[PDB]
Amino acid sequence: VLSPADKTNVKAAWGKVGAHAGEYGAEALERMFLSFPTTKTYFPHFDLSHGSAQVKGHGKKVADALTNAVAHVDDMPNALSALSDLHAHKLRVDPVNFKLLSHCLLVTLAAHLPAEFTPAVHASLDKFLASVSTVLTSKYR
Amino acid sequence: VLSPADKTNVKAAWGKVGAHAGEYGAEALERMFLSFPTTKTYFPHFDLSHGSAQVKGHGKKVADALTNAVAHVDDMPNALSALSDLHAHKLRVDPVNFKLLSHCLLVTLAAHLPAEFTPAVHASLDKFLASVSTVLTSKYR
Amino acid sequence: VHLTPKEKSAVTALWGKVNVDEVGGEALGRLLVVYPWTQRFFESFGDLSTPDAVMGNPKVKAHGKKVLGAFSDGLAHLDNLKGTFATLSELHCDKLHVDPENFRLLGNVLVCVLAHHFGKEFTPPVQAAYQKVVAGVANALAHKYH
Amino acid sequence: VHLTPKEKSAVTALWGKVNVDEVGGEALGRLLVVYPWTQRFFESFGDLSTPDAVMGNPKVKAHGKKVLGAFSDGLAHLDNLKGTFATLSELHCDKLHVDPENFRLLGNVLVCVLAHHFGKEFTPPVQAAYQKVVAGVANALAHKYH
Ligand code: HEM
Ligand code: HEM
Ligand code: HEM
Ligand code: HEM
């Protein structure tokens, strides 16, 4: 469960991301594809090379979903319900892969927001991304 | 999330356990200690040998908690809140270990309830134990 | 992986009673039912819409037979699982890109199927020996990732 | 584990800039803060009540220094991590009984600390090289379980 301090920390850190939201999402995907090449197979219709417009566009979608989750942090199962159906049913994304993308999102935030990425905020962000991952893996059928 | 069919399957399978509830819990612990010896270190004040009265007594507690979860399956965070505090705060149980005990509970049920352990019921029981594990690991601080 | 002689005995004695035409398909079918994301790798197998459809699917039973054959082969070479599973590692890691967590899951599903079939004969010490085996197999199948 | 020459270059060049007195303690402290169950193994270290308490704890910084030393030693022997980590494997697996998932977690926390310290210099390809390294180290530390 996310504590009041966790929600405050996540909102504050994500607030600093700003107009870079989409960019950071795209960078996290790139980090995931390079570090954990098994994850690439979910995107055969994507060119996954650096500067790919498809990865850039997708990073914005990922960021927008995370922003939705931050904005509705006390109601995340509802806010992410459609995305949960998509990832678990249609795409059949292996639950391990959410841990991989969550790690790459943390690395991206650490690399861009050194003042915000305190040990406490790192912990809050990890709990938040784990909560998001728990919702997105909740619909396997 | 547990579906209506999942809840029906879990209630039916757990209903067959009966007065063997405590016994099966004790057997699952024994299976865990022998198969995954890292888990033994949580019980230094226990004699973990076969026929141990302490493992028998503890198996009953484990079973009673699972029975509570079955009886309050739509309200499990609330029903298991005290147990979540205990396992995450006081005992600091590594989240991996819940996957290990859940597997040993499935093996125990399979070994005792061959008619009940259909593929569908196996799936429902796995989702149920994962849901229980998610609650019991929800309070790390 | 190192099994005691007592564990080797327990493992080999039980394995001799295994129905080699059925147990592999039961384990693979249950993997597909219990962990539905694994169906991603088996779109060519046809009807996987219900648990009954999965378990009765002739391709699941046939493929399951191949998987079990590989476990049998591992049991014969417990001191050289890496060599035994090298080609399978290249297939599952380099070609298929299956996350290795799923190797662990299939091994644990196999353990559940053995418990189902053998009942009280699948004692806690017999299980502990089989857990060493399926962990060994999973680690060897994952070698190309290491 | 096999790194390309380009990856070896990226890894060694960055590691030469690492503050070896501080980065290990930062990684170990963050492990204790982010994954609080790991505090179970460090009751003798005293005050771990708050993140500030953890990060400022002299024993955490000192022990962190030892951990980083072991990673440095691994970087020098990428083609023999098993031998390099044998005594540490016996300690962490046979004596301490730390679940090996936590070896992976500490490696990933170290990667976050490197990203924090190096910023844009910690590029996605540099990270991918370090992920190979910390996976290699985790697998070698876990050898006594295999
Ligand atoms: C923090 C976790 C994640 C978030 C917030 C997220 C968010 C999203 C969003 C917003 C979309 C687009 C939905 C739409 O257009 O209808 C999407 C699609 C998709 N996601 Fe994720 N995702 C996450 C994790 C993952 C992971 C771990 C994988 C696989 C490794 C994955 C694979 C995909 C794929 C394959 C698509 C469809 C792309 C396409 O066909 O165009 N996602 N995700
Ligand atoms: C299905 C998952 C689990 C359930 C339902 C469960 C249930 C329980 C219950 C009912 C108690 C007694 C509570 C009390 O007396 O106040 C307990 C205590 C305890 N549990 Fe669990 N538990 C689970 C998983 C685990 C795991 C995975 C571990 C460690 C590997 C663990 C370690 C302990 C310990 C060390 C105690 C305290 C024993 C003592 O000091 O007497 N539990 N658990
Ligand atoms: C201990 C774990 C496993 C063992 C021992 C095993 C064994 C095998 C064997 C013997 C084959 C036949 C290869 C051949 O025809 O020469 C095979 C093929 C295959 N396996 Fe597995 N497997 C394991 C886990 C998995 C998992 C977890 C998945 C996916 C979730 C998977 C996906 C596949 C697929 C898609 C094929 C067909 C490849 C092809 O025909 O090109 N395997 N496996
Ligand atoms: C890549 C992962 C790790 C590395 C490289 C590593 C390295 C080390 C090193 C170098 C020492 C000093 C041993 C000595 O004094 O000779 C040590 C001790 C210790 N480690 Fe780690 N470690 C890792 C992961 C972990 C984790 C995840 C935990 C617990 C969550 C842990 C718990 C301990 C403890 C309790 C000691 C003190 C043992 C003693 O003094 O008797 N280690 N480790």
GROMACS .gro file of C-alpha atoms and ligand atoms in nm, chain A residues 94, chain C residues 28 31-32 35 37-45 63-71 85 87-88 91-92 95-107 110 134 137-139 141, ligand 3:
model
   90
   94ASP     CA    1   0.480  -1.186  -1.900
  310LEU     CA    2   0.229  -2.826  -2.030
  313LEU     CA    3   0.117  -2.426  -1.748
  314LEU     CA    4  -0.101  -2.279  -2.025
  317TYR     CA    5  -0.009  -1.902  -1.636
  319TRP     CA    6   0.062  -1.552  -2.078
  320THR     CA    7   0.260  -1.863  -2.176
  321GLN     CA    8  -0.003  -1.920  -2.451
  322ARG     CA    9   0.177  -1.641  -2.640
  323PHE     CA   10   0.432  -1.902  -2.754
  324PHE     CA   11   0.173  -2.154  -2.876
  325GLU     CA   12  -0.060  -1.973  -3.115
  326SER     CA   13  -0.008  -2.247  -3.375
  327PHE     CA   14  -0.159  -2.510  -3.142
  345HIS     CA   15   0.446  -3.140  -2.730
  346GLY     CA   16   0.418  -3.227  -2.365
  347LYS     CA   17   0.564  -3.564  -2.453
  348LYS     CA   18   0.873  -3.395  -2.593
  349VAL     CA   19   0.915  -3.183  -2.282
  350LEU     CA   20   0.893  -3.485  -2.057
  351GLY     CA   21   1.152  -3.661  -2.273
  352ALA     CA   22   1.391  -3.374  -2.200
  353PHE     CA   23   1.329  -3.402  -1.825
  367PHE     CA   24   2.034  -2.879  -2.237
  369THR     CA   25   2.066  -2.705  -2.781
  370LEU     CA   26   1.741  -2.653  -2.589
  373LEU     CA   27   1.625  -2.266  -2.881
  374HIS     CA   28   1.440  -2.127  -2.578
  377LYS     CA   29   1.546  -1.815  -3.077
  378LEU     CA   30   1.227  -1.807  -2.868
  379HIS     CA   31   1.328  -1.551  -2.605
  380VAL     CA   32   1.118  -1.718  -2.331
  381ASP     CA   33   1.179  -1.547  -1.998
  382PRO     CA   34   1.366  -1.800  -1.781
  383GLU     CA   35   1.124  -1.747  -1.490
  384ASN     CA   36   0.888  -1.964  -1.697
  385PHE     CA   37   1.134  -2.255  -1.689
  386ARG     CA   38   1.097  -2.245  -1.311
  387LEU     CA   39   0.720  -2.229  -1.340
  388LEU     CA   40   0.696  -2.531  -1.570
  389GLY     CA   41   0.920  -2.727  -1.336
  392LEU     CA   42   0.550  -3.072  -1.318
  416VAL     CA   43   1.367  -2.911  -1.175
  419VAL     CA   44   1.696  -2.820  -1.537
  420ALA     CA   45   1.570  -2.461  -1.530
  421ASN     CA   46   1.918  -2.323  -1.459
  423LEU     CA   47   1.797  -2.429  -1.988
  577HEM     C1   48   1.202  -2.695  -1.811
  577HEM     C2   49   1.141  -2.624  -1.906
  577HEM     C3   50   1.128  -2.666  -2.054
  577HEM     C4   51   1.171  -2.778  -2.119
  577HEM     C5   52   1.249  -2.899  -2.063
  577HEM     C6   53   1.133  -2.764  -2.258
  577HEM     C7   54   1.160  -2.859  -2.358
  577HEM     C8   55   1.127  -2.839  -2.493
  577HEM     C9   56   1.147  -2.936  -2.598
  577HEM    C10   57   1.208  -3.076  -2.575
  577HEM    C11   58   1.106  -2.886  -2.715
  577HEM    C12   59   1.111  -2.957  -2.852
  577HEM    C13   60   1.229  -2.900  -2.932
  577HEM    C14   61   1.244  -2.979  -3.059
  577HEM     O1   62   1.143  -2.999  -3.131
  577HEM     O2   63   1.359  -3.023  -3.087
  577HEM    C15   64   1.056  -2.751  -2.692
  577HEM    C16   65   1.005  -2.662  -2.787
  577HEM    C17   66   0.938  -2.544  -2.754
  577HEM     N1   67   0.927  -2.483  -2.629
  577HEM    FE1   68   0.989  -2.572  -2.450
  577HEM     N2   69   1.065  -2.645  -2.273
  577HEM    C18   70   1.061  -2.581  -2.149
  577HEM    C19   71   1.002  -2.458  -2.120
  577HEM    C20   72   0.933  -2.383  -2.214
  577HEM    C21   73   0.849  -2.270  -2.182
  577HEM    C22   74   0.830  -2.222  -2.036
  577HEM    C23   75   0.800  -2.219  -2.297
  577HEM    C24   76   0.704  -2.100  -2.317
  577HEM    C25   77   0.633  -2.045  -2.218
  577HEM    C26   78   0.848  -2.300  -2.409
  577HEM    C27   79   0.817  -2.276  -2.543
  577HEM    C28   80   0.851  -2.367  -2.644
  577HEM    C29   81   0.813  -2.358  -2.783
  577HEM    C30   82   0.729  -2.244  -2.843
  577HEM    C31   83   0.866  -2.463  -2.849
  577HEM    C32   84   0.854  -2.498  -2.999
  577HEM    C33   85   0.983  -2.453  -3.069
  577HEM    C34   86   0.984  -2.494  -3.214
  577HEM     O3   87   0.918  -2.595  -3.250
  577HEM     O4   88   1.051  -2.426  -3.295
  577HEM     N3   89   0.929  -2.400  -2.354
  577HEM     N4   90   1.069  -2.727  -2.554
   0.00000   0.00000   0.00000
